[PDB]
């Protein structure tokens, strides 16, 4: 199917406790493949998937150089942001950046991304045109003017349409055993009485990859959106993900409820019921 590549970056200042901590990770789809942490004893970008391990020493050298440069730029940016928001030098602040690309099943660019957030709030984003900017506030407008003057969007566009797509294609081929394999969920329904009058039905999805999934309960064929407890999709630690959806049902009405599961690993969406 379609695929994505993303680089995520977080810098967190800590006045009085040294320079900001910088952590960056790279993903293809829902698979972590590279990491860098400035607080590691001798920081280097490290592999986190088997299919990237074959990249040679020069790859890791270049990647590490970029990581350290990005950490330095972020340190400058954090000092600038204090000025832009008239903030004291005493507090901890956060700068986050993501960039990357989505491609279709033919490997063609669907769209590119480059966006930044300060203290957990959107700051400035490259628009889908890869040519213009959306600034969140008057501070970000100052960045926008700077980046317009520097034609920064033009360089980002060139990367996102070129290397981002090309390297993603490479990684997909090198990781074809795993990146191009969907693992369908293993599903079951459990029943837990709460009282004489009601019981919980919990519909489980386990062992699935990628993480995108839809779990819904219906009663008499009607979606039970407001009455369904859905937990966030969560990682198992073996690449796969887990999720459940629960509804509280009147005792005796269990057969009126059906759990519906959609996942790209499933040829057709599944319908499950409690099987006593």
């Amino acid at each position: 199917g379609s695929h994505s590549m993303r680089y995520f970056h977080t810098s967190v200042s800590r006045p009085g406790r040294g320079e900001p901590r910088f952590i960056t990770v790279g993903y293809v789809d829902d698979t972590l493949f590279v990491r860098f942490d400035s607080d590691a004893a001798s920081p280097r970008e490290e592999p986190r998937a088997p299919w990237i391990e074959q990249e040679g020493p020069e790859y890791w050298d270049r990647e590490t150089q970029i990581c350290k440069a990005k950490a330095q730029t972020d340190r400058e940016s954090l000092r600038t942001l204090l000025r832009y928001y008239n903030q004291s030098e005493a507090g901890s602040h956060t700068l986050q950046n993501m960039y990357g690309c989505d491609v279709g099943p033919d490997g063609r660019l669907l769209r590119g991304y480059h966006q930044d957030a300060y203290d957990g709030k959107d700051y400035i984003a490259l628009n889908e045109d890869l040519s213009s900017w959306t600034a969140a506030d008057t501070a970000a407008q100052i960045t926008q003017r700077k980046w317009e003057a520097a034609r920064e969007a033009e360089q980002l566009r060139a990367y996102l349409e070129g290397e981002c797509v090309e390297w993603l294609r490479r990684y997909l081929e090198n990781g074809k055993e795993t990146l191009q394999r969907a693992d369908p969920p293993k599903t079951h329904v459990t029943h837990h009485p709460i009282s004489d009058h009601e019981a919980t039905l919990r519909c489980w999805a386990l062992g699935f990859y990628p993480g995108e999934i839809t779990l819904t309960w219906q009663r008499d064929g009607e979606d039970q959106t407001q009455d369904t407890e859905l937990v966030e999709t969560r990682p198992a630690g073996d690449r796969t993900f887990q999720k459940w959806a629960a509804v509280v049902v009147p005792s005796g009405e269990e057969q009126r409820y059906t759990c519906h599961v959609q996942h790209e690993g499933l040829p057709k969406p599944l319908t499950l019921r409690w099987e006593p």
């Binding site: 680089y7 790279g26 790859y59 270049r62 990647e63 970029i66 990581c67 440069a69 990005k70 730029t73 400058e76 940016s77 600038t80 942001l81 832009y84 700068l95 960039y99 930044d116 700051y123 400035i124 960045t143 700077k146 980046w147 520097a150 920064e152 360089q155 980002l156 990367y159 290397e163 981002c164 390297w167």
Partner: peptide, 9 residues
Amino acid sequence: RRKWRRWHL
């Protein structure tokens, strides 16, 4: 692989 260029805020 990562991009080579960036600009501070």
